[PDB]
Amino acid sequence: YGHSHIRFGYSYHVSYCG
Amino acid sequence: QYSPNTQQGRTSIVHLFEWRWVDIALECERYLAPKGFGGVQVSPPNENVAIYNPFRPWWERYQPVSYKLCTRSGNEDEFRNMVTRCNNVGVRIYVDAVINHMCGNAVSAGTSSTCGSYFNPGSRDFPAVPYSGWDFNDGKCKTGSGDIENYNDATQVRDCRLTGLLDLALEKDYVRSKIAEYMNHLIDIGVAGFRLDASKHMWPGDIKAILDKLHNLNSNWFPAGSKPFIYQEVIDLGGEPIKSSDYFGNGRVTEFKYGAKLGTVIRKWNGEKMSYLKNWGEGWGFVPSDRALVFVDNHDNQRGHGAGGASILTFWDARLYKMAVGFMLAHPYGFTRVMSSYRWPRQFQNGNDVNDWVGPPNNNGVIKEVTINPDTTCGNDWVCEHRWRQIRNMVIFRNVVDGQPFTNWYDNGSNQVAFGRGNRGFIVFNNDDWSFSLTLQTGLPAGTYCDVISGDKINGNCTGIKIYVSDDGKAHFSISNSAEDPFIAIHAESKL
Ligand SMILES: [Ca+2]
Ligand SMILES: [Cl-]
């Protein structure tokens, strides 16, 4: 949700944003 | 909750990130105890989801299945054995307590967990705890997606799903008791305290309510009436409604400003210079020293997208990293935690590492043993920054200079700075692109001091640089900007 507060690293975030 | 409960004269803990319990126990005996380390922060010891897409990521351990002490790091016997052996040699154990959430809501139901416990995120069913739908915040969370969307709403940060992780209802006595039952089980085994994971996502009152259920520490290793050391993970760089001071009543807080600012200063980004570190501490707008858990990097932000972003120094920047850790360990502010990491195939595309999910070194998902090389470094892709001579000796430096005031500061108005710790230690830094050749007041007794950064004191002689302090306390320091480590640290126990 956005890119402001990333947690668990980039790769986790990208799969979470999808 | 503010005292680390370490043995007298041991002033730092090390994060043995994803280490196996037996490796930690051996590490306590063979290294951490003789080298003066105060304690160890362990990866979450409770059962978590086994995630195979991607293949066993490090962050699978922040998605609890139950409170069984059963992980890729070992079973309850191995954990109990690690805690016993470490306490017996004077090194404490601090548990990463993942108490804000269970696993993600969209995780497939089944037994794909580290102890094979059944769990059904879809139905909010974790029978191994047991938890049900009554024990989660589905009702209380007011957001459209059920997840945390707006960080400027402190209620939603607390009551909604952190990146979709099922958010427990910590206002309910039943949920507080199961967590406290789990934490008290670890206290009875002998742990000295806890890192409270995602404390920003729990209400301070809920934390207090849980902590009030906790026992005193095990009286075999701790004095009667000892309380568990509590440091709460709260990411607060300012400008958000949630303030890390809101948690001061429960214990210490992680000061993420520490590593963020220190990294920018040492990278010389944004016009920052080391000479600005003269008032380091509360002066920089940090939490009170007695409330601060400090560190250069942590397990999360060392991958580049945590609190502090690209400014965080890691083992990947080994030369600059050693200087930041040395300064942290030399400066009296806060309780210092040293990071100990593992290697992973960092692969950048557009400044983003697509492999930052990779878990510890493994053989088909089984975490590799930590092997020790004859030069005391680690094999099997374990970095062991805590075993680096430059860092380990500074851990000892902090023990030697414990309680001594920050004094005798010097700077050149750029990046060549130095300071002392009472009459027990002195440290000199050269982060400018030219040589540092100067005579400085060290405040130390006259003598020949081994530089613990370039070498060691072994059999009444130094293996590295030697510093000669005169009767006036003055000593000449000569540090090339091409030096392997452009900083020198001497203390009372490095005097010949
Ligand atoms: Ca929460
Ligand atoms: Cl942390």
Side-chain angles (χ1 to χ4, degrees), chain A, chain B residues 2-496:
Chain A
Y1 291 44
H3 263 57
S4 40
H5 300 71
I6 301 187
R7 185 176 180 86
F8 308 129
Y10 179 85
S11 173
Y12 174 96
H13 198 60
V14 151
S15 64
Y16 172 63
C17 295
Chain B
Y2 307 118
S3 315
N5 307 311
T6 58
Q7 300 210 339
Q8 187 196 352
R10 303 178 123 107
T11 57
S12 290
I13 72 185
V14 51
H15 183 191
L16 294 184
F17 176 48
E18 292 272 15
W19 282 49
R20 304 165 50 241
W21 304 150
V22 295
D23 291 330
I24 298 182
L26 214 229
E27 188 74 0
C28 280
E29 292 157 346
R30 75 184 162 189
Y31 197 83
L32 303 168
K35 299 305 181 188
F37 285 76
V40 172
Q41 174 184 305
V42 299
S43 289
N46 63 285
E47 173 174 22
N48 60 269
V49 175
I51 297 183
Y52 291 96
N53 188 64
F55 182 68
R56 315 307 308 267
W58 63 269
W59 42 257
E60 75 161 55
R61 302 185 65 151
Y62 297 95
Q63 304 206 26
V65 164
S66 75
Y67 298 121
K68 297 176 181 193
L69 310 182
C70 184
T71 59
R72 290 207 293 170
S73 280
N75 61 33
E76 174 161 340
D77 289 342
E78 290 166 315
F79 182 87
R80 284 185 181 258
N81 181 257
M82 173 200 62
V83 179
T84 299
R85 285 161 72 185
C86 288
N87 273 327
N88 285 339
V89 295
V91 180
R92 305 295 183 208
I93 293 299
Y94 306 91
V95 157
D96 194 348
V98 188
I99 60 170
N100 168 76
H101 55 258
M102 296 298 122
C103 67
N105 70 96
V107 175
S108 290
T111 63
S112 185
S113 48
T114 52
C115 228
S117 284
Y118 174 81
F119 63 103
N120 189 336
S123 64
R124 313 293 189 258
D125 203 85
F126 299 82
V129 173
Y131 282 142
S132 71
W134 296 104
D135 308 310
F136 294 87
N137 279 330
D138 293 293
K140 207 68 132 52
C141 172
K142 304 280 136 233
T143 199
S145 75
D147 290 12
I148 300 174
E149 308 175 354
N150 176 24
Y151 274 74
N152 300 282
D153 176 19
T155 301
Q156 135 180 217
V157 174
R158 270 69 166 263
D159 295 334
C160 292
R161 290 188 309 211
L162 169 65
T163 69
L165 298 169
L166 290 169
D167 197 68
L168 292 161
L170 307 183
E171 71 277 16
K172 289 181 57 190
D173 187 78
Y174 173 76
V175 181
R176 300 165 163 181
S177 305
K178 289 305 204 168
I179 288 173
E181 172 180 46
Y182 164 59
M183 300 179 69
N184 274 332
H185 183 209
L186 298 165
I187 294 178
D188 294 351
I189 292 170
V191 313
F194 303 91
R195 166 189 191 272
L196 296 191
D197 179 71
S199 285
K200 185 191 209 177
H201 306 276
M202 309 184 282
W203 292 97
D206 289 342
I207 297 183
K208 187 195 157 187
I210 295 181
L211 303 180
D212 289 349
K213 299 184 179 287
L214 297 185
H215 301 160
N216 300 331
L217 298 188
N218 192 293
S219 63
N220 293 326
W221 296 287
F222 304 94
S226 312
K227 293 163 179 179
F229 181 46
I230 296 298
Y231 58 106
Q232 300 156 101
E233 181 225 335
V234 174
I235 293 178
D236 180 12
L237 307 178
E240 295 204 340
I242 290 166
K243 300 294 164 195
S244 69
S245 71
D246 296 349
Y247 298 84
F248 285 173
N250 301 326
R252 300 198 183 214
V253 180
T254 59
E255 182 54 275
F256 279 94
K257 294 175 201 202
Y258 198 94
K261 301 288 202 172
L262 188 57
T264 297
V265 165
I266 290 186
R267 295 176 178 275
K268 303 175 259 178
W269 288 1
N270 197 23
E272 296 274 49
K273 304 185 295 197
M274 271 199 90
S275 70
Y276 300 161
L277 300 177
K278 180 184 182 182
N279 66 322
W280 190 242
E282 276 201 86
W284 277 55
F286 298 170
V287 301
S289 180
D290 277 344
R291 297 298 176 268
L293 191 289
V294 305
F295 50 93
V296 171
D297 55 341
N298 85 337
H299 63 275
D300 185 88
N301 65 15
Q302 70 170 194
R303 290 159 166 75
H305 283 281
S311 289
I312 302 302
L313 292 167
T314 76
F315 65 86
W316 294 105
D317 318 291
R319 185 166 188 268
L320 294 189
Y321 181 71
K322 285 176 288 177
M323 270 208 302
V325 177
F327 184 95
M328 173 183 76
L329 290 170
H331 197 273
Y333 174 84
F335 193 72
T336 48
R337 179 185 64 201
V338 177
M339 183 60 195
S340 196
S341 321
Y342 58 79
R343 305 191 162 88
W344 76 91
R346 191 170 69 158
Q347 172 70 311
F348 280 120
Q349 112 170 3
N350 305 314
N352 302 317
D353 178 22
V354 297
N355 293 333
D356 63 359
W357 59 268
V358 170
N362 61 99
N363 289 308
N364 193 21
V366 181
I367 295 172
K368 293 179 184 185
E369 42 166 10
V370 172
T371 56
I372 301 306
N373 298 318
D375 68 354
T376 60
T377 58
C378 291
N380 278 344
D381 289 325
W382 300 99
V383 180
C384 298
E385 305 98 292
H386 71 280
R387 286 172 163 261
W388 293 2
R389 166 181 44 79
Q390 305 91 331
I391 292 179
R392 172 245 303 155
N393 284 352
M394 286 306 301
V395 165
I396 289 160
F397 181 100
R398 191 176 187 76
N399 291 347
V400 171
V401 308
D402 188 33
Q404 296 289 291
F406 178 89
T407 188
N408 278 316
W409 171 270
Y410 161 82
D411 71 79
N412 69 336
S414 192
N415 299 286
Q416 295 179 344
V417 307
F419 65 90
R421 298 296 308 283
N423 302 117
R424 279 270 181 166
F426 196 70
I427 188 165
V428 188
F429 292 93
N430 178 22
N431 204 22
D432 281 317
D433 299 318
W434 57 94
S435 279
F436 191 160
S437 197
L438 192 67
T439 297
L440 292 171
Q441 176 58 237
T442 78
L444 282 177
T448 295
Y449 290 78
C450 296
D451 166 40
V452 300
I453 301 313
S454 58
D456 289 280
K457 174 186 180 178
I458 301 181
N459 306 132
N461 215 289
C462 313
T463 64
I465 301 177
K466 275 162 162 184
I467 301 308
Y468 307 105
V469 179
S470 309
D471 303 330
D472 53 7
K474 296 184 176 191
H476 190 74
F477 295 86
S478 187
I479 308 164
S480 167
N481 58 298
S482 291
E484 193 200 346
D485 298 286
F487 72 115
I488 293 177
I490 59 183
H491 58 72
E493 297 303 335
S494 72
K495 185 196 188 291
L496 297 184

